[PDB]
Design a protein around this ligand. Sequence first.
Ligand SMILES: CCCCCCCCOCCOCCOCCOCCOCCO
Ligand SMILES: CCCCCCCCOCCOCCOCCOCCOCCO
Length: 772
Amino acid sequence: QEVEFDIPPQALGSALQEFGRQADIQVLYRPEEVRNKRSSAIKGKLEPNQAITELLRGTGASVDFQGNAITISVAEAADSSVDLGATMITSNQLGTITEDSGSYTPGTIATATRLVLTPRETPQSITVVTRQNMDDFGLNNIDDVMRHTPGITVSAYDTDRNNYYARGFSINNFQYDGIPSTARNVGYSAGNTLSDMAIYDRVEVLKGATGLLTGAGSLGATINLIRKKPTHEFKGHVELGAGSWDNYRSELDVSGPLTESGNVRGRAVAAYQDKHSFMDHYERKTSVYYGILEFDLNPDTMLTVGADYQDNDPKGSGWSGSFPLFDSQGNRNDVSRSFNNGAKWSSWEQYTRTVFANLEHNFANGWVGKVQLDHKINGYHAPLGAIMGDWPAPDNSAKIVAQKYTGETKSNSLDIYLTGPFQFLGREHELVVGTSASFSHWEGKSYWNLRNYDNTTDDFINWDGDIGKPDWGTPSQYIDDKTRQLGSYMTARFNVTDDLNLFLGGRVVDYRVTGLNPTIRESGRFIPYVGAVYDLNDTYSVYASYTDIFMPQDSWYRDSSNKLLEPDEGQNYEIGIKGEYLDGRLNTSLAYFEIHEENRAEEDALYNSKPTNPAITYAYKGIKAKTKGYEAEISGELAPGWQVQAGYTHKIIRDDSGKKVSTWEPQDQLSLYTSYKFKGALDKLTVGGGARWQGKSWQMVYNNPRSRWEKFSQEDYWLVDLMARYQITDKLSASVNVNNVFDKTYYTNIGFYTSASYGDPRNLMFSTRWDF
Ligand SMILES: CCCCCCCCOCCOCCOCCOCCOCCO
Ligand SMILES: CCCCCCCCOCCOCCOCCOCCOCCO
């Protein structure tokens, strides 16, 4: 709607970048097309579509309107067949904004290489949950979003930490606006499983091996969370929502110019949720605040400062799973879904805050430069207490384990990178060159030396949490770990023919972990990136890529010889076809992929049976493992009011024993979410539904009292979601989400330290949203 403009005549490139910014729109244009042209002048309050054609007057260019993006083209009377994936310079370095897109398919993405590219242009598997997907299905945190992310599996560690798999691996890579955090372990990583969606536009998941931009990390995927940004027109909303088990949420979101001109601009959000739970004596309050100002130092240099804050504060936390699998004498426990072995006072509170600043500058080259500075904090306060062990006993008694960890991790990050186009053999290519540095320092207290506590409870079947709290005594331990990561990376994207694009890149990495453990050092490790995309028609392209990642091992993973295991490493091999329909409004992909892992830490049973090096007491073994699997997906418009996201993934991961692994992650899964917007008499109603199926999953767990291994299975099952919205008024709407319609009872954890967790029963959520 009607924006305030001011673009004086200049290089058409500069104008287009200046426009994207002022319009809150992404502008894509091909450098060689706009290079010897200038904009015509525009001034005043205008509608962006009128505005742009006025800007383009005299230039001979056409506009393609596409949601939150415009692409500019310069048609010739010539043309010999088209360059569908021609080098395109872009006005927003993170991609197209999904807020208000009306869509479940992303626009353009930078998660792969730092280069702004469409899913069809990216030679990796990239899934995105958009802002509208999030709104329609009430996905209010990262757990909700992973549960709705095709190809991800969410399993429980305990009431306050989940695990995300892809392709056989636990995901342990998180970025925010494309900047990796340190996630070496749960010390560094407080709150990562729990971020509220209130401050984010979309989460984008890059599946495979993602070393190129993550640096040191896990195989499986990177999760990239893009923050909400300020806008040039005023707007916002308030939201109220009320759900099953005394689940209350509120949320405020405000955005706009802060000066009469528009040269300073801000966005603020605050969200608060207080919920109980189907689980007995578990409650959890969450708080979030967020604020960001953008300042135009001048028409091609912008400074951003912002901060965010999230507190997650539960009662009734468990340490591991909701209940023990086996009783004192070895029989499987049968307990209600409400069972919670957490104590009343038990809490794993987790907090996160960031202070951050950017500087982004446009060189009249058409090259853009960007510096990103971060102060991150990840803190935890964890007085835990939870029935654990083979219980109850015959007289219905049980025993509690209690320990207390507190601590904070402080992180500092510098990320700097240049990106731009270049001519080579008569054609346009582009390149990114960046360097990065992060130092993060985990400091902590632990307590396990309980003074004079009676950790037995008189009654299991009716356990309440109603147990005393111990005297924690003095600290048992002080933690002091320091990680330093340093990167340099470079990727070229060569437009080789009119249907072939070749990716040649790499990261060199220096990684040092310091402190109470023997220093862990990796110098000059190379991480290769090779990719290709071949256009087939107006619609389909094939792609192949070879990609890599590593993580230096945790310091307790030493071998026979008391020598740290080589880094845990893998390569992703992928070949696929990707389809594009309705000018980018609908995307399909079908991929085959193979992960080759090497140096996967494993127990070393033959040494462990009777150790023989005085140096080590419990060695590990570095083995190879494989993932073989295929994946298909669709997202976007199936017909005018009709949006979907859906996926199908098949996997089996084996290790050098030949035995299946990550067998809790099902071998097959499907997701399908959809909504429909009626027209005519009922254009104000949006109706929606969803299904997630997964096939058999299992775990070998050891039944101590009987001295035998057992197989625990989860037979395949469906979960059904439904959804409706009614826009009663221009400014006000109502919603209902029913989740797990058929109240399926199933498991989200079997065998995590010999325990189990249930999935959510059927739950409802009612919301109003009010847009100013
Ligand atoms: C070193 C700490 C850094 C702190 C950075 C946080 C910045 C906090 O900014 C919050 C303000 O956001 C602005 C909200 O935008 C609302 C604008 O509407 C203004 C009123 O409009 C009147 C006429 O249109
Ligand atoms: C174990 C739970 C079993 C419950 C199953 C329920 C399935 C049926 O749900 C139907 C819900 O219909 C209720 C309609 O109520 C209207 C809500 O509209 C929101 C009002 O907005 C407030 C206006 O300011």
